[PDB]
Paper text:
AMP-activated protein kinase (AMPK) is a metabolic stress-sensing kinase responsible for regulating metabolism in response to energy supply and demand. The AMPK αβγ heterotrimer comprises a catalytic α-subunit associated with β and γ regulatory subunits. Adenine nucleotides (ATP, ADP and AMP) bind interchangeably to the γ subunit where three of the four cystathionine β-synthase (CBS) tandem-repeat sequences provide nucleotide-binding sites1. The α-regulatory subunit-interacting motif 2 (αRIM2)6 is required for sensing the adenine nucleotide bound state of the γ-subunit and transducing this signal to the α-catalytic domain, resulting in either stimulation (AMP) or inhibition (ATP) of AMPK activity.
Secondary structure elements of αRIM2 are crucial for the isoform specificity of C2. We propose the weaker interacting α2 isoform αRIM2 is incompletely engaged upon C2 binding relative to the α1 isoform, resulting in the α-isoform specificity for allosteric and synergistic activation and protection from α-Thr172 dephosphorylation. Importantly the structure reveals density for seven α1 RIM 2 residues, including the main-chain of the nucleotide sensing α-E364 (α2 E368), further supporting our proposal that the α1 RIM2 interacts more strongly with the γ-subunit. Interestingly there was weak density for the carboxyl group of the E364 side-chain, possibly indicating a transient interaction with the γ-subunit residue R70.
Residue numbers in the entry:
A (entry chain A): 8 to 344, 358 to 366, 393 to 468, 526 to 545
B (entry chain B): 78 to 176, 185 to 270
C (entry chain E): 24 to 123, 125 to 326
The structure:
């Protein structure tokens, strides 16, 4: 009668509070079906200026189709609030499971980590980084399956771009995150996954202290105790995943190649595996069939879920899947690893942009002088970051370029050159614009 | 179309009275400090007020309208954009934008003196694709899969014999091309 | 007939499907000197490079080892004097002498079929075809006969094998068997370069004093004169020019007339060589079968 209802679901007890908004349990008034409703206050989003962050979060969750990421069914909009109707999991937090059992057994800990990394890899392949991975954000269902949830601190991955934001709990944050340094960000998740793996097997944090600067010193140092009950195999995996240097730090491919992770690993969690192509849907292939056959996505699915595999739409999808597999298997043909015949003919080392020992203020003045000589026009978005433009006299098109000053060491400084993409040649236009400024500056 | 009526303020008993219910008291469900009711309302202007602990009141954070006799009641404007999520986020972004084309003028360094230090160079950019040794077995044109962060960035050689050599990795559709240009200075 | 299945395969697949995930492309500006450009082919490990005209703001052609072969034979005088035109001339200056025949830029789009790419290489009698995107105007990859045959070798199990693949080389008669230009073991480099210019052939089989074929002096073996900096001494024998690379060379690789077409294709792909020496039952030289002759049979003519 007086029940608080949204889209046939009665709102109940608060499950918890995340990065943005509150999460409550939603029971269906007729069936009793349970959902998790994330309430986002429109005024709170406008006040915090996170309209773009929420927009990307909804877009990603609507696109994401993984058995280890919380599914978003729908998002009901009201003149004051946003109601994100999500998938409900009874088991709750992974953090609460670790505390209840003390230590998660190797058989279960490996199984859970494989499910977590499967979800993390899906995010990375879709150019999305979670940045807040912890057992508090990793949920469990009735069948004990891992599910990642809070995409509040998540961000997009762009070509030649870096993420600076500092996100998540200090105990799970990477050394570059706490230091406020720039990062690619796939690596940051690996560090977080490394802490979760230690927390699952040990029941404690590898970097934990009452004093915040002492805790930060432990993360930057990268020194953590490895208990006697842990075998040498998982110990080396935790060490490789928890590396101070992001370059020396393990990648998903490195974790997938590890002997401990390989054990009892299902062939459907990761791409290129035996039972992946026959059980997991490929989003890029469905869109390719939809434009070729001039039909909807639901009709392509109906042909795949049908009794006969010889169905017109199903065979066209698998032809793309088969062709992709042949090309993916022949790694030596597409990527570099008796000598090669072409190598019978064959060193100067390459470097990034221009290096300078001069004062940062003096370097700026040299760039502004050089651009003027070349008649470049620029946008001064930041003190050390510029967006320069030049109109080509032959092609009659503008050439966009991004200038950024970096600190190599205590005495060295670097000027970075980056191409911006919206007859000639776009790449040649970038090189010629670079060559003009390099000659003028030196 | 659903409409949310939340009372952030205190009290034991809170009632909702508005033009949508012919100005009658509707009991609100309380969780903690929240008194709420989700009502299905059409698009347009709607006037409403709260009845807390036997007295008439209004939400100070919400827009208000005053009648001839001096009775304050909140006014809500149900818009077509409020029904859809992406339409509402497009309106919310417009309100967010608060207080610059291409020019040939140099930037003033900082307010006063910033003493601003440039961002520390990421180690990912130092990973030069052309330096990396592929090994004898493979074809010389073949290269390892580059990191997305090093794409579009310029890498050069020291000017020798009056010729400048420039290189950058760029992406065609799912493929990466590392072009090299030998251009004289 | 089970034939023309490979022809349908080339028509269905785009040029994009052959471009590697991560590749290296070397481009030269027309104003750059020839000597520096030929050394750049060695240092980077490339056999060809597209030419970018800075004034016209468009790709004009390709700089191959054939240019170095033509420069050496036209301007070489003695080991005592230096080849002035190789030392001082630019690519722009060389093109004004060599291509004056104003040849247009022979290229293909990445979205275009492989049938068109195979046709463009055979029709124009070229071995290097640049892949230029019409949207950006950038050169992506340089298509060769070797890359096409290697890609086709990955899908041979996916399509039913035609009757000609099971048939012998003697029955099909693929490759050149008459008018084979050959060089003796004592012949100098300058003479061998002259036959590359006049006859316009890619390789020359080296014959011993007894008459047996010892090695093969191909157009690719000429860049070693720029690599070892031994280009101004073209008076030395072919054997003296090949001995330094003879250890990891493996030039001569033979195929028998009785052997099936399928085994010949598998041999060319695995060894990564451009051509095989056709031999009889008594191990005597009958002819030469190359990657171009093979793809002309599989793709073209039906
Ligand atoms: N955070 C917080 C918050 C809310 O709780 C709500 C709610 C809400 C409040 C309480 C209840 C409720 C009332 C009685 C019993 C159980 C409940 O979950 C349901 C929804 C509607 S919009 C909204 N926006 C918010 O920012
Ligand atoms: O006609 P080209 O495309 O200029 C050319 C240059 C070099 C070759 C060549 C090398 C080789 O071992 O077989 N053919 O072909
Ligand atoms: O004129 P051909 O001997 O038939 C021939 C076949 C293949 C090639 C070749 C040369 C080259 O640099 O890439 N492909 O040349």
């Amino acid at each position: 009668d007086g029940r608080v209802k949204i889209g046939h679901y009665v709102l109940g007890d608060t499950l918890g509070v995340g990065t943005f908004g509150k999460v409550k349990i939603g029971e269906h008034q007729l069936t009793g079906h349970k959902v998790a409703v994330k309430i986002l206050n429109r005024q709170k989003i406008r006040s915090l200026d996170v309209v773009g962050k929420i927009k990307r979060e909804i877009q990603n969750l609507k696109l994401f189709r993984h058995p280890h990421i919380i599914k978003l069914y729908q998002v009901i909009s009201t003149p004051t609030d946003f109601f994100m109707v999500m998938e409900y999991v009874s088991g709750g937090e992974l953090f609460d499971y670790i505390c209840k059992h003390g230590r998660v057994e190797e058989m279960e800990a490996r199984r859970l980590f494989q499910q977590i990394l499967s979800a993390v890899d899906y995010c990375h392949r879709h150019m999305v980084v979670h940045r807040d991975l912890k057992p508090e954000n990793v949920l469990l269902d009735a069948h004990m399956n891992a599910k990642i949830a809070d995409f509040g601190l998540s961000n997009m991955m762009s070509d030649g771009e870096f993420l600076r934001t500092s996100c998540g709990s200090p105990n799970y944050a990477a050394p570059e995150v706490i230091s406020g340094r720039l990062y690619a960000g796939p690596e940051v998740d690996i560090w977080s996954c490394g802490v979760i793996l230690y927390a699952l097997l040990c029941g404690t944090l590898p970097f934990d202290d009452e004093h915040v600067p002492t805790l930060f010193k432990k993360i930057r140092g990268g020194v953590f105790y490895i208990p006697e009950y842990l075998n040498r195999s998982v110990a080396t995996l935790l060490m490789h995943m928890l590396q101070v240097d992001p370059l020396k730090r393990a990648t998903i491919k490195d974790i997938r190649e590890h002997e401990w992770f390989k054990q009892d690993l299902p062939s459907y969690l990761f791409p290129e595996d035996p039972s992946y192509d026959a059980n997991v849907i490929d989003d890029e292939a469905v869109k390719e069939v939809c434009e070729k056959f001039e039909c909807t996505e639901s009709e392509v699915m109906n042909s795949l879920y049908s009794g006969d595999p010889q169905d017109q739409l199903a065979v066209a999808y698998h032809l793309i899947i088969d062709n992709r597999r042949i090309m993916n298997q022949a790694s030596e043909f597409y990527l570099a690893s008796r000598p090669h015949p072409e190598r019978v003919p064959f060193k100067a080392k390459w470097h990034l942009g221009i290096r300078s020992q001069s004062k940062p203020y003096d370097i700026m003045a040299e760039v502004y002088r050089a651009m003027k000589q070349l008649d470049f026009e620029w946008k001064v978005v930041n003190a050390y970051h510029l967006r320069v433009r030049r109109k080509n006299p032959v092609t009659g098109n503008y050439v966009k370029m991004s200038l950024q000053l970096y600190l190599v060491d205590n005495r060295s400084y670097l000027l970075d050159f980056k191409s911006i993409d919206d007859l000639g040649s776009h790449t040649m236009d970038f090189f010629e614009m670079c060559a003009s400024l390099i000659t003028t500056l030196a | 179309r659903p409409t949310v009526f939340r009372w952030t303020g205190g009290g034991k008993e809170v009632y909702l009275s508005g033009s949508f219910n012919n100005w009658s008291k509707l009991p609100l469900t309380r969780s903690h400090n929240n008194f709420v009711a989700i009502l299905d309302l059409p698009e347009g202007e709607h006037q409403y007020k709260f009845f807390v602990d036997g007295q008439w009141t209004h939400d100070p954070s919400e827009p208000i309208v005053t009648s001839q006799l001096g009775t304050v009641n909140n006014i809500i404007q149900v818009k077509k954009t409020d029904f859809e999520v992406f339409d509402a986020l497009m309106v919310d972004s417009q309100k967010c934008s608060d207080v610059g084309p291409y020019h040939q003028e140099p930037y003033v360094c900082k307010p006063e003196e910033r003493f601003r230090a440039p961002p520390i160079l990421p180690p990912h950019l130092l990973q030069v694709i052309l330096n990396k040794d592929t090994g004898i077995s493979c074809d010389p044109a073949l290269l390892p899969e580059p990191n997305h962060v090093m794409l579009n960035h310029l890498y050069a050689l020291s000017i020798k014999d009056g010729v400048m050599v420039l290189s950058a990795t760029h992406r065609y559709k799912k493929k990466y091309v590392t072009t090299l240009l030998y251009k004289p200075i | 007939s089970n034939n023309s299945v490979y022809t349908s395969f080339m028509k269905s697949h785009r040029c994009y499907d052959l471009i590697p995930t991560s590749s290296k492309l070397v481009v030269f500006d027309t104003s750059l000197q020839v000597k520096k450009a030929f050394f750049a082919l060695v240092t980077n490990g490339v056999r060809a490079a597209p030419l970018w005209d800075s004034k016209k703001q468009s790709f004009v052609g390709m700089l191959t080892i054939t240019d170095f072969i033509n420069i050496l034979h036209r301007y070489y005088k003695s080991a005592l004097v230096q080849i002035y035109e190789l030392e001082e001339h630019k690519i722009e200056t060389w093109r004004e002498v060599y291509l004056q025949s104003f040849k247009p830029l022979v290229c293909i789009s990445p979205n275009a079929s492989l049938f068109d790419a195979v046709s463009s290489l055979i029709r124009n009698k070229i071995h290097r075809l640049p892949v230029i995107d019409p949207e950006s105007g950038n050169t992506l990859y340089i298509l060769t006969h070797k890359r096409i045959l290697k890609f086709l070798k990955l899908f041979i199990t996916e399509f039913p094998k035609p009757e000609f693949m099971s048939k012998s080389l003697e029955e099909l008669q693929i490759g050149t068997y008459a008018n084979i230009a050959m060089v003796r073991t004592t012949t100098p480099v300058y003479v061998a370069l002259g036959i590359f210019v006049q006859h316009r052939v890619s390789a020359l089989p080296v014959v011993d004093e007894k008459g047996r074929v010892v090695d093969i002096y191909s157009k690719f073996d000429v860049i070693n004169l720029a690599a070892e900096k031994t280009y101004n001494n073209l008076d030395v024998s072919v054997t003296k020019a090949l001995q330094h690379r003879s250890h990891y060379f493996e030039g001569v690789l033979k195929c028998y007339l009785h052997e099936t077409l399928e085994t010949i294709i598998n041999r060319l792909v695995e060894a990564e060589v451009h051509r095989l020496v056709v031999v009889d039952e008594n191990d005597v030289v009958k002819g030469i079968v190359s990657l171009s002759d093979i793809l002309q049979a599989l793709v073209l003519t039906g």
